[PDB]
Structures are given as structure tokens and as C-alpha cells.
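Methods: holo model generation. Sequences were used as deposited, without trimming of termini or removal of tags, and paired with ligand SMILES retrieved from the corresponding compound records. Each pair was processed once, and we did not select among multiple samples. The sequence and magnesium ion SMILES for this entry were:
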Amino acid sequence: GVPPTAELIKDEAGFETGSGEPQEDFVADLSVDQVKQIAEQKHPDLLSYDLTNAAKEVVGTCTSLGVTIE
Amino acid sequence: PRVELEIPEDVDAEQDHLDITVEGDNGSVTRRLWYPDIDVSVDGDTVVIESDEDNAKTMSTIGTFQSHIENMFHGVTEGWEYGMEVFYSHFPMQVNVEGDEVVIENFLGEKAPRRTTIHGDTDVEIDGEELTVSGPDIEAVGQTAADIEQLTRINDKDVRVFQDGVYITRKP
Amino acid sequence: IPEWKQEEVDAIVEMIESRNTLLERALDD
RNA sequence: GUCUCGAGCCCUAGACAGCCGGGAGGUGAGCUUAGAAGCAGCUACCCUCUAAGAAAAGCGUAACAGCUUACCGGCCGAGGU
Ligand SMILES: [Mg+2]
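and the model returned the structure below.
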């Protein structure tokens, strides 16, 4: 239902395209709360029981694009 | 070694010399199981295959005799059935059972009828483009089925283009 | 005596406290 | 082909093989591209549910689909490699 992860990131990140080589080319950044919000939309798309695990999944499609955390 | 085969309640198996006969509601099958130092016998309710030798060659036949007998058990009860489909592209192939042999006419437009004789008490039933080969003797049934497929064999031309013939659809 | 089998037997006994052979196992202790 | 002898490893906490069932989600990863969604190329190859299940080992498609390997479970039961 709710739009994919790759898109929900490009919004609150301010950037459109990722990086040719991830974790090596830190394109964007995301606050902890910025990821907490993206974990509130994908409640159905994810299999996790707690909001904690829901984050982990989302936080797995960022460092593989250059979306550092802080 | 020694292997014991418990015969099914539906069946009764008799044996004299190197010959074993298996009778069931679906018929009877007699076979010769002859090999150096391998004794096959009917011990009341079980068939026994034993030998004092255990070399690779002996073990090979022992295992072979087992499946032969087990296959006979299955043949006299549930029976054996091979399914076949007659496929043709341009020339309508006529497959009929005449006497104790299946005849195929107009194969690839051939004027001369191709034919093969049926082995043993094997029954061949045809229902349109479907054939069913059946009987209690897997040897006889298997061959009859195979012979039918081999009957439409073509060596002269490219088989990928000339695919006409009867083929084995289901194997038991 | 693979360790993962021993560790699984423990994890099973733990959930029972609060493979079919590892279940059967975790039922006899 | 067959006979004999040795070494290592796995196995009744069920091995080897076969058969049945499962082979799931984030997500059709990002990039490149009109498109590429395991499988044209480049890079990375991360975490959830769980008894398993790759950012996919091999076919397959225009691309999907589809078919299976890995992996887990059952059936079986004795040696297997
Ligand atoms: Mg020619």
C-alpha cells in the first residue's frame, strides 16, 4: 500500500538519486526521529512486532546508499 | 546375505526349481531367477533370497531379484499401466488394436501399415488420442509400450521437425 | 555432539519452561 | 570390472540418497536505463519473521512469469562420504 522505502527516504533526505558506491559516498543524513517516522508508515509492509525492529529494516536500506545517521 | 519379502495377503506365490510364480486377483506372473549361488525360496508367508557369497556381483543380482519379485507382487494386485499419446502434425495417424498386435496406418502419409505384436497378457486400450498399456507382467507391458513408441521411429529425417508418433505419457 | 544441537535443546527447554527429536529431547529433561 | 589394505570426516541428538512440504517479508535492493524487478553491466551484499529461506548457485523471459540449487522441516532407518 504505502509507497516504498527508497522513496520515503529521498523526501526527508532532500536528495533524489543515491550513490554509485554506498557507505563510501554519504549522500544524505537522517535523524533518529526521521527514521522513527518512516517506521510509522510501513507498519503493514513490515513483519516485525515492535517498532524497534521495524526501524532496523528501514535502517538497512540507507547505509547501502550513503544515508549516514545522527 | 539374506533378504525376506513378506508376500501381500491378496497374493500367493509358488516356486519350483529356478522358477517363481506369483498369482493375484489381477493375474499370474512366472519368472526364472537364475544366478550363481543365489537361492530363492517360498518360506510360508515370505519369499527368501539368500546367498553365501557377498561380492559386488552377487549383491547386484540379489537387489535385482528383490525388485523383480516386488514388481510381480504389484503386478498381480494393482497391475502395471503405461499411458501413451498419439501425436501427429499433417497426416492423421490411425492407431488400432487388431488381433494380438497394435497397427498404425498412414504414418507420415505412408501407404504401408506399421505394426508390432503385443507381449503376453498385456492389454492395449485406445480412447481417441490416448492409449493405455496394462498387465501384471511389468516386463511384457513395458516392452509393449516401448515397442509402440519405437514403431514410429524415424532416422532418415530431422526428428525436431518430424515429431509424429505415439509417446509414453505416464510411467508407473 | 554438535553444539548447535545442544544449544537448540536448551532454547527449547527454555520456552517450554515459560526437529522432532530436539523437541522430544527437550521434553525428557 | 573386481578383490585387498590404510587415512580423514559425517552418522540413531537419524547421517548419504530419494520422495513430500516449506522455500517468506522490507524490496520490483541502489545505480545504469524507456525498462532490468536473483540472474545485461557497476556497487553494495545490509535486517525482519523463523524451524528454514542468497541484495541469489543454474536454466528461463523483450522485461515480468515460470522451473529448480542453496538453506529448514517430515517420511524412511544404517551406514555414508
Ligand atoms: Mg536429408
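The longest strand of chain A covers residues 28-30.
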